[PDB]
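User: We ran a pulldown and think these components assemble together. Before we commit to crystallization trials, I'd like a predicted model of the whole complex to look at. Sequences follow.
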Amino acid sequence: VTLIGLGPMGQAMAGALLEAGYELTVWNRTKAVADSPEALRAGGPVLLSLTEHAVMYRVLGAESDLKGRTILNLGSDTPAASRAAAAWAEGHGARYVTGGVMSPAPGIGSSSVFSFYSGDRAAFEENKALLEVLTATDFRGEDPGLAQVYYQILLDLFWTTMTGYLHALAVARAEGVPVGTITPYLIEDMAMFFEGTSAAVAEGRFPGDEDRISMDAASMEHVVQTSRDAGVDTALPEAVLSLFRRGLDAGFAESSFARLVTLMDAE
Amino acid sequence: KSPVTLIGLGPMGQAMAGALLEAGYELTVWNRTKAKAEALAERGAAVADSPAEALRAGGPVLLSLTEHAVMYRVLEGAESDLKGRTILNLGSDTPAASRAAAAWAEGHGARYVTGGVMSPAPGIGSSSVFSFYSGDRAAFEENKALLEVLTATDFRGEDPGLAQVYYQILLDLFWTTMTGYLHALAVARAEGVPVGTITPYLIEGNDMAMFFEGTSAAVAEGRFPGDEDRISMDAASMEHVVQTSRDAGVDTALPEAVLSLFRRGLDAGFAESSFARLVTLMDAE
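Assistant: Here's a predicted model for the assembly, 552 residues in total across the polymer chains.
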C-alpha cells in the first residue's frame, strides 16, 4: 500500500496500516519512503489524505504511472471536485473511489467509527479489508461524488453545533458559571427533536401545534440580548436569529420551525 | 386540596394548568380575555375577575408570560396584594430582567423564585424533563412538590437571575444546533438524498458527548494545542461545507457565519491552535 499526505489523518492512517502488517510506501514534500510521487509504482492501492483535491493535481507530473492503478481518495472536498478528480484519474487509466472519513485522527484504529465510500465498486471491494483497518466502511454507490455529499452534510451539522457549543461556553464564563458545572447540562435529547423535525420536513405541512415561529423568534431574541448584556460576541446567535426573522418576513409566523427549511432549499 | 394561582395562558400555561388540575390542585386563573379560561373552568378551574383577586386566592402565584415586562402591566392595580405572596416566575427572559423582576417583587413584600423550564408544552407532566430554579430557597422548598408536578426540579442558588442564565445558555446551543440540522437537511434535499435516509446518520454519526467534553476541558485549561486538530484545517473543512452548499444552490448564510468565526481565528494568528481557542474571540472583554 502507498500513501500520500502526512497531516494528522495520514500519520494515523499510516500507523494503523503498519500495525496491521501492510508493506507501506509514503511520499511527502517535508523531510519529517519514496523519492518521488515512484510511490505510485510501489504496487499497492494509492491512498490520498490531502487538504484538498487541487493538491492532487499539483503533487502528481507522474500521470503516465496512473495507468492500471487504483486511487482511494480519503480527503474531503466538494462533490463537484470529487467528480472531477475521479474523471481525471479515470482519464489516465486509474480506478477511483472516494472516502469520507467520519473520525478524527485519534479515532482511526477504533471500532466505533465509520467512513462513507463511493465510486468504483470493484476497486472498493478489492480494498475493503484494507479500508476496514482504518474504520468500518459504508459504500453508498458508484457516483464518486456521493460519499462526499454524505460527508459534507454531516460536517455541516457538526461544525454548526460545535461553534454553538463554544458560544454557549462563552456565555457561561461571562456570567460566572464555571465550565465544569455547565458542561454536563450542555451534554445532557436531540434525537427526539431531530426525528420530529425530519418527519415534518418530509411531510410538506408545518402545523404550529407544538411550536410556532413567532414564539421561536422571540426565544432567540432573548438569547441574543442575553449575550449582548454579558458582553459576549453576538455574530453567531444573530445569524441564527436572522433565519427566524426571514421566516417572519415570509409570513411563517404561525407555522412550525421546520418550515424554515424552505428558506434554505434550492430552487 | 392545595391552592395555586396561575397567570398567563399561552401553550405553556395551558399545559401547566392541566397538569395541576390532574394532580388535584385547587387552581385559580386570570387572563386578559375571558375565552381562554372558560376551557379550564369547564375542567374545574376558578376564574378570577382581576389580577388582584387572583393573587388573593391564597396559593403561590405562577407566571407564564411572554416577557417580564408583562408582569409590571398586569399587576399594576395589585401591588398592595403582593405582600406576603410568593411568585414563581416560570417564563423566560434575560437574567437582567429576571433580577429586576425579583427586586421589584421583593420591594412590595413578596418572595420570588425564577424557573427555566426545559420542556416544550407537550412535555409538561412527563418524567423525562427538568427545570432550573433559583431565587428564594425557602419559597422553592415550600413549593417543590407542586413544581415536581410540572417537571423534575434543579435548584441552582439564591441569585434570581441564575436559573435564567442556565436556561438561555442551553437554548443558545439548542437553536444553533437545530438551525444547523435544518441546513443539513436542505443540502440533502438539494443533492437528492432522501430525508429518511440521511436522518439516522445526522442523529448517530458523531458522538458529540466526546467532542464536547474534550472541548470543555481544553477551554478550562487555558491552552489549545494543535497536535491532533488545528484551526487551519478546521477552516478548510468549513470552506468545503460552504462551497458544497453554493454548488447545490442552497442558502449559505448560516454556514458562512460559522466560517466567519474560523476566518477571524486565522486573522488573529490561531492557525496552529485547536478549535477551542476560538472561544477567546467570543469571550467578554
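Residues 64 and 91 of chain B are 5 Å apart (CA to CA). That may be worth checking against your pulldown data before setting up trials.

User: Thanks, that helps.
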